[PDB]
């Protein structure tokens, strides 16, 4: 299923919400470390079947 | 098989770090290894660290 | 001090290994990056110049 | 041996205040030999052994990061913050003072345009922070001054916009110390010299108290030879980094019953570290536990080496660090 | 610029086409550190006609 | 021509100025030369990365 980019992601975390807030994209200029999130991605896996 | 494209730059401010090479116009090739502290740094009469 | 201006540890004598009547040991653990050459030169010009004794 | 005032005692004869920034004090009673050993044991005591104050954190109203260039400004967001590096302010007796800047129209933003705080003493009011080209362009920052130990790299320092862009620091008052020889001119004898120390302080600590403090540091660096009642231990530190990864193990390693395996997990308990942090006096309040469900856990914890009422380290373990 | 030179460092930055060169006289409107606009006097003074 | 110009400046004329040691404190035998040199920091290639 084709994925889409949006700020409102059904994730179980908040780290991916702190950055992405401008509806899919993220604001300019900031500071963290390598191994984070740049663009929110929502790609279902296992045919939505656990 | 692609919806849209999202480009994100990655500007890095590389600061001075022991490992690079320095050469003027005459060919005085060199390399920084150890940063000499100011405490044990001799100076002139008026007091001017090298 | 009382106004908290030092913020650094000051060395002090603790033990004097007397192996002889003339030769001994004077240790000084509490040191920092810079004072190592300071005290080593502020007394070097004294123990080899400003010393009484007799011969 | 003797030891009875064989040398002369240094005394302040006359000071020279050529300027409000630089001075030329000098001592008179100096024997030939102490005019170099005392100058060398001080030249390296004022190049990093001086507190001072400088700018560290700044807000800026409008700019988000060191990339966003504010409109109505001749320079960029970078250069305009490099000026704050030269901005020096002496604090009476505080470590955290917030200053606010605000103005409008054309004209170089001087240091005298900032708020006037009683505890804040501006060194150079004619200090330029930023130049405003557009008359309709406004500028405002929350410049706060701290008190480190000299220079604080921005790379070492820097979620949501709070502190945002920060700048370097330079708490170190003087940047250079020199010493001269010069033979003193006493009225007693001939063999006498003078130290004469030249200091170029930014204007935070006056030279008269700065030089004396330098020698004071050396004094405390010898108080153990003057036979003084100071019985303090040097360094008795014991370092051997260790941890308990076993505490990071779930509660499914203590062999419990289905009952407790459903009550604990329902009370936000997935690891053994999330249960120890609590107490067996508040867990009795919950109408889903008891006393036999707590004494059974402590029985197994006896073999693991854990018990209720103990602090934890590196907890929680690897999670979703934002 | 180096304290000493030969007088050939200027002719380089010109032919290379690095610095901006005006092709018509006139005053300067804005001087932003990211955009500069110069208005010429070839048309009647009009807010939307120049 | 240069030697004649070196007459002015500050005080020296040969270039060798008295250098005071910050370590021992004793002046270095035979003064050394001190002046401005035009150097350059060459780019750090990523082919020598650790």
UniProtKB/Swiss-Prot annotation, chain C:
The outcome of changing residue 45 to C is: In rpoA112; temperature-sensitive, blocks RNA polymerase assembly
The residue ranges crossing the membrane are none
After translation, the protein is modified as follows: (Microbial infection) ADP-ribosylated on both alpha subunits by the phage T4 protein ModA. ADP-ribosylated on only one of the alpha subunits by the phage T4 protein Alt.
Oligomeric form and interacting partners? Homodimer. The RNAP catalytic core consists of 2 alpha, 1 beta, 1 beta' and 1 omega subunit. When a sigma factor is associated with the core the holoenzyme is formed, which can initiate transcription. Both the N- and C-terminus interact with different regions of transcriptional regulator CRP. The rRNA transcription and antitermination complex (rrnTAC) consists of RNAP, NusA, NusB, NusE (rpsJ), NusG, SubB, ribosomal protein S4, DNA and precursor rRNA; S4 is more flexible than other subunits.
- Record text about domains: The N-terminal domain is essential for RNAP assembly and basal transcription, whereas the C-terminal domain is involved in interaction with transcriptional regulators (such as CRP) and with upstream promoter elements.
**Family to which the UniProt record says this protein belongs:** Belongs to the RNA polymerase alpha chain family.
Q: What does this protein do?
A: DNA-dependent RNA polymerase (RNAP) catalyzes the transcription of DNA into RNA using the four ribonucleoside triphosphates as substrates. This subunit plays an important role in subunit assembly since its dimerization is the first step in the sequential assembly of subunits to form the holoenzyme.
This chain's protein is named: DNA-directed RNA polymerase subunit alpha
Source organism per entry reads Escherichia coli (strain K12)
- Taxonomy of the source species: Bacteria, Pseudomonadati, Pseudomonadota, Gammaproteobacteria, Enterobacterales
Curated annotation (Swiss-Prot), chain F:
Posttranslational modification: Acetylated on several lysine residues in the presence of glucose.
Q: Which residues form a coiled coil?
A: none
Biotech uses: Co-administration of salinamide and rifampicin or salinamide and myxopyronin suppresses the emergence of resistance to both antibiotics.
N6-acetyllysine is carried by which residues? Answer: 7
Top-level taxon of origin:
Bacteria
Quaternary structure and partners: The RNAP catalytic core consists of 2 alpha, 1 beta, 1 beta' and 1 omega subunit. When a sigma factor is associated with the core the holoenzyme is formed, which can initiate transcription. The rRNA transcription and antitermination complex (rrnTAC) consists of RNAP, NusA, NusB, NusE (rpsJ), NusG, SubB, ribosomal protein S4, DNA and precursor rRNA; S4 is more flexible than other subunits. In pull-down experiments interacts with CedA.
Query: Which protein family is it in?
Result: Belongs to the RNA polymerase beta chain family.
Q: What does this protein do?
A: DNA-dependent RNA polymerase (RNAP) catalyzes the transcription of DNA into RNA using the four ribonucleoside triphosphates as substrates.
Q: Under what name is this protein listed? A: DNA-directed RNA polymerase subunit beta
